[PDB]
Amino acid sequence: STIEEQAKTFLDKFNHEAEDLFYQSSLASWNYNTNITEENVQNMNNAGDKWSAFLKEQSTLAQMYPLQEIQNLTVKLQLQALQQNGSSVLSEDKSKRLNTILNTMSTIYSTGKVCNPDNPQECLLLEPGLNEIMANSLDYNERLWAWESWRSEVGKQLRPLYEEYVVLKNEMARANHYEDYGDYWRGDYEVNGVDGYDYSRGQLIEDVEHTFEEIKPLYEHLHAYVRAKLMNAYPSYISPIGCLPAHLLGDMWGRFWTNLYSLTVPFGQKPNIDVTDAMVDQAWDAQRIFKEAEKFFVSVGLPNMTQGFWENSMLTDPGNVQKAVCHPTAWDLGKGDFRILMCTKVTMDDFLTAHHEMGHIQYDMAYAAQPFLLRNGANEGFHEAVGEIMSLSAATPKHLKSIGLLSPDFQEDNETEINFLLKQALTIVGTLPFTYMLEKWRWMVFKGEIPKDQWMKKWWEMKREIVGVVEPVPHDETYCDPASLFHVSNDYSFIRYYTRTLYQFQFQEALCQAAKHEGPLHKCDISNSTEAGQKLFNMLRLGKSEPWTLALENVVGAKNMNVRPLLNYFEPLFTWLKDQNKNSFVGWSTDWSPYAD
Amino acid sequence: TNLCPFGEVFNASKFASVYAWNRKRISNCVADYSVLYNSTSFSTFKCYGVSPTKLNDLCFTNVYADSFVVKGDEVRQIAPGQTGVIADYNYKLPDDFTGCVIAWNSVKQDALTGGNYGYLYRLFRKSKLKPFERDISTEIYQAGSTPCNGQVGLNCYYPLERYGFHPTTGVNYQPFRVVVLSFELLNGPATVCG
Numbered sequence: 001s002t003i004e005e006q007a008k009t010f011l012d013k014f015n016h017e018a019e020d021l022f023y024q025s026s027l028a029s030w031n032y033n034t035n036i037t038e039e040n041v042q043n044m045n046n047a048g049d050k051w052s053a054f055l056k057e058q059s060t061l062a063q064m065y066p067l068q069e070i071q072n073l074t075v076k077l078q079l080q081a082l083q084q085n086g087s088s089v090l091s092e093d094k095s096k097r098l099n100t101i102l103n104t105m106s107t108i109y110s111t112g113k114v115c116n117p118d119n120p121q122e123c124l125l126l127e128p129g130l131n132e133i134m135a136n137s138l139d140y141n142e143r144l145w146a147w148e149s150w151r152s153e154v155g156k157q158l159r160p161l162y163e164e165y166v167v168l169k170n171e172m173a174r175a176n177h178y179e180d181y182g183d184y185w186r187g188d189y190e191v192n193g194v195d196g197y198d199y200s201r202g203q204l205i206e207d208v209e210h211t212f213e214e215i216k217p218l219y220e221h222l223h224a225y226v227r228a229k230l231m232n233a234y235p236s237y238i239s240p241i242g243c244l245p246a247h248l249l250g251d252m253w254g255r256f257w258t259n260l261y262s263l264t265v266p267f268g269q270k271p272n273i274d275v276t277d278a279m280v281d282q283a284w285d286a287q288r289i290f291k292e293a294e295k296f297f298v299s300v301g302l303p304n305m306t307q308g309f310w311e312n313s314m315l316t317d318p319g320n321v322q323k324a325v326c327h328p329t330a331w332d333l334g335k336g337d338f339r340i341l342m343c344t345k346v347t348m349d350d351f352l353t354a355h356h357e358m359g360h361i362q363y364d365m366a367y368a369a370q371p372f373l374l375r376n377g378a379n380e381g382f383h384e385a386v387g388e389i390m391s392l393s394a395a396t397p398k399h400l401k402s403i404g405l406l407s408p409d410f411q412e413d414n415e416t417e418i419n420f421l422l423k424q425a426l427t428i429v430g431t432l433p434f435t436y437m438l439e440k441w442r443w444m445v446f447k448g449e450i451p452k453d454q455w456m457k458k459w460w461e462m463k464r465e466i467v468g469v470v471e472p473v474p475h476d477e478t479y480c481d482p483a484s485l486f487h488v489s490n491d492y493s494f495i496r497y498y499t500r501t502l503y504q505f506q507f508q509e510a511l512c513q514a515a516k517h518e519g520p521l522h523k524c525d526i527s528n529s530t531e532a533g534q535k536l537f538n539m540l541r542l543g544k545s546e547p548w549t550l551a552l553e554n555v556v557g558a559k560n561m562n563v564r565p566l567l568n569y570f571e572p573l574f575t576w577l578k579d580q581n582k583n584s585f586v587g588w589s590t591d592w593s594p595y596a597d
Numbered sequence: 598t599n600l601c602p603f604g605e606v607f608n609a610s611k612f613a614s615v616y617a618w619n620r621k622r623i624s625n626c627v628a629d630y631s632v633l634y635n636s637t638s639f640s641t642f643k644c645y646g647v648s649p650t651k652l653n654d655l656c657f658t659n660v661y662a663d664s665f666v667v668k669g670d671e672v673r674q675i676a677p678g679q680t681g682v683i684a685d686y687n688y689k690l691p692d693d694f695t696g697c698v699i700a701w702n703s704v705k706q707d708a709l710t711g712g713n714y715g716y717l718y719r720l721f722r723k724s725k726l727k728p729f730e731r732d733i734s735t736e737i738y739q740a741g742s743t744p745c746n747g748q749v750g751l752n753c754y755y756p757l758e759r760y761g762f763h764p765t766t767g768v769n770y771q772p773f774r775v776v777v778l779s780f781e782l783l784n785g786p787a788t789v790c791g
């Protein structure tokens with residue numbers, strides 16, 4: 001007779017209908033992904049339209065229940081997740097305009113046609129072209145040309161589209177009682193109505209800035225080392241005490257520094273660890289790789305994979321006669337149907353990636369008992385952390401000697417440890433300042449603290465101040481260099497990567513302390529540690545039914561984000577960099593530029 | 598001295614829905630429960646008060662055999678003192694249960710590629726069911742307070758949803774054909790035993 005009873009019954013009806021509808025949708029999407037035809041795309045699109053129409057109608061029916069008159073926390077969470085319709089709050093003409101803007105930006109990014117001025121008929125696309133150019137090449141002029149050309153070809157066109165996009169998104173967010181679109185994104189980490197576990201939306205910015213201020217020294221030492229090694233690799237194009245040029249960072253933007261491993265290797269004569277040949281010798285295939293992953297996951301006490309997984313998953317490239325996308329994914333089709341779609345070669349990298357995807361699948365299987373609307377991570381940055389901790393635990397030499405891929409007489413030394421830690425810092429520590437600066441700029445542009453006639457100026461000076469990266473060519477206010485990234489031009493939140501990088505090391509430290517690991521944290525293996533597996537499952541089984549702060553406390557014992565585990569992980573490389581850079585200036589001056597001589 | 602029609606009960610082609618479970622009165626025959634015990638094709642065979650292998654040399658007045666289909670994780674509701682959408686709104690057993698439950702996986706028969714949406718079950722009810730009572734009504738459930746005149750609208754929805762059975766769904770969502778026996782004692786003579 002009350003309102004909460006009606007809300008509960010409506011949520012029951014919605015769950016029981018949406019589960020079957022989403023199962024059909026994901027099933028059609030799977031049939032498309034493993035079998036690329038035209039009728040399969042038709043069925044996938046039709047199921048997607050059905051699911052979206054059902055979701056919109058259910059949000060319309062759910063907006064009739066006020067949250068202020070609901071006491072149950074789980075019912076309130078489900079009603080709040082179902083009531084957020086999105087763009088339907090704005091007008092119809094503005095909605096269609098915003099949709100066309102997004103589609104145009106995505107199309108211009110995906111089909112960017114940049115070509116050298118020497119011959120217009122032949123030229124390189126983004127993926128098989130500019131990426132390999134910025135990742136493998138070494139000529140300074142070539143990388144500069146690639147960078148500047150892609151920028152002037154993409155951002156110069158995306159600038160007015162991005163301006164109108166910003167205005168329309170701010171309008172939509174202010175219509176949804178938010179302050180701006182950045183606040184709408186920060187609403188993911190928001191927690192309300194839980195005494196002792198609350199979390200505001202500006203507290204996210206506060207903790208992010210604090211954690212980055214605590215990270216600053218390690219990143220500064222890594223940046224000094226990389227600048228020295230690049231000055232060795234580029235004799236007259238890098239200042240010894242200045243910033244690094246933006247096109248020498250290993251890719252189109254400088255997101256990851258993984259492509260500087262060969263240029264910045266500590267001991268180039270020591271062979272980095274690789275178990276591909278031991279796999280080739282012992283007749284290792286996809287099935288054996290995934291069986292070893294399942295065994296690793298069941299050793300910590302987590303349940304093994306289901307039969308439907310081994311019967312329905314696409315673990316090998318299905319020959320040539322039928323084409324399929326070869327991006328590794330963890331599929332939660334619903335109704336207890338978990339699958340993995342991955343074209344796995346006989347490689348150690350594919351081995352670690354299979355471990356990562358099976359960690360995703362384990363996390364999916366954990367919270368399968370939660371209601372439909374609560375079957376997801378605690379926040380946006382939990383799944384990839386759960387995957388990365390498994391990748392780290394399975395990549396250690398102890399595990400590789402355990403499964404018999406490494407000789408028992410292997411003499412691990414400080415040189416290989418330092419090499420591995422430096423590569424890990426290039427792929428991990430190198431992306432944290434980039435991510436933080438990009439999300440800070442995007443939040444400040446969504447807020448209004450950056451007028452549209454100051455966009456690129458503030459962007460570049462923030463990059464120089466935070467990331468320590470300087471552009472090689474001055475850019476006027478016609479560029480939209482942020483939109484040159486996939487996430488900025490396709491409407492994706494970027495802070496999940498920062499939060500995930502911190503959460504994965506928090507998880508690793510807690511799981512290793514629960515495993516009674518003695519020694520450095522980078523040599524930790526959670527294998528055969530059922531106590532750690534239980535400590536992790538206690539959070540994995542929650543889903544998003546509890547505040548993410550409580551879920552984090554359930555593992556690391558602390559309610560808040562922290563960088564102490566990451567620093568404790570990278571202490572050995574930190575002391576090594578401190579011992580190495582004592583004869584070199586650490587830091588950067590935000591004034592020196594390669595275009596002002 | 599006849600064999601009880603267990604063939605047209607277990608080996609039957611299609612089982613009824615859980616909200617309309619088939620109720621068959623078996624009597625005046627000879628049933629050896631040892632072959633049902635040793636079939637070893639069922640995943641659940643549990644009852645208390647009398648052992649199944651020890652019950653063979655016993656009989657009562659009349660026996661009832663309930664049969665239906667549910668999901669995989671819904672066979673645990675078929676037990677005395679349980680709570681769930683099946684134990685309350687679809688099929689209730691008394692605490693003084695005298696028979697037991699026979700359930701087995703039936704994906705080969707009740708699951709078709711594309712979805713077998715022919716199995717129904719009641720989701721809502723104004724009050725929980727009493728033990729051994731059937732409800733096959735089709736009236737609309739009133740969640741709110743205003744009458745909706747037998748039409749679905751706000752706070753009004755058909756209280757009969759369908760099981761979506763697919764051959765690929767996990768065991769917790771696979772169709773499980775459930776058979777439930779009942780042994781009642783009256784003042785009449787015993788007619789059905791080995």
Ligand SMILES: *[C@@H]1O[C@H](CO)[C@@H](O)[C@H](O)[C@H]1NC(C)=O
Pocket residue numbers: 035037038039040322
């Ligand atoms: C892929 O789809 C085509 C038609 O769209 C069908 O003929 C073919 O059998 C399918 N292949 C597989 C492996 O299912």
Ligand SMILES: *[C@@H]1O[C@H](CO)[C@@H](O)[C@H](O)[C@H]1NC(C)=O
Pocket residue numbers: 008071072073074075
């Ligand atoms: C919320 O409702 C669920 C049933 O849907 C119940 O199990 C739970 O205890 C309730 N919690 C609160 C705080 O009311």
Ligand SMILES: *[C@@H]1O[C@H](CO)[C@@H](O)[C@H](O)[C@H]1NC(C)=O
Pocket residue numbers: 304305
């Ligand atoms: C997974 O664990 C169950 C539990 O005993 C076992 O029956 C099954 O054989 C295991 N799967 C594999 C592939 O070993």
Ligand SMILES: *[C@@H]1O[C@H](CO)[C@@H](O)[C@H](O)[C@H]1NC(C)=O
Pocket residue numbers: 299398399402403525527528
């Ligand atoms: C885990 O325990 C199993 C069983 O004793 C053993 O075979 C394996 O080598 C162990 N692995 C590790 C990493 O401890």
Ligand SMILES: *[C@@H]1O[C@H](CO)[C@@H](O)[C@H](O)[C@H]1NC(C)=O
Pocket residue numbers: 603604607608638
């Ligand atoms: C019905 O079919 C099943 C499966 O073939 C079989 O095991 C069972 O014995 C059959 N029923 C009878 C009464 O024989």
Ligand SMILES: [Zn+2]
Pocket residue numbers: 356357360383384387
């Ligand atoms: Zn992943």
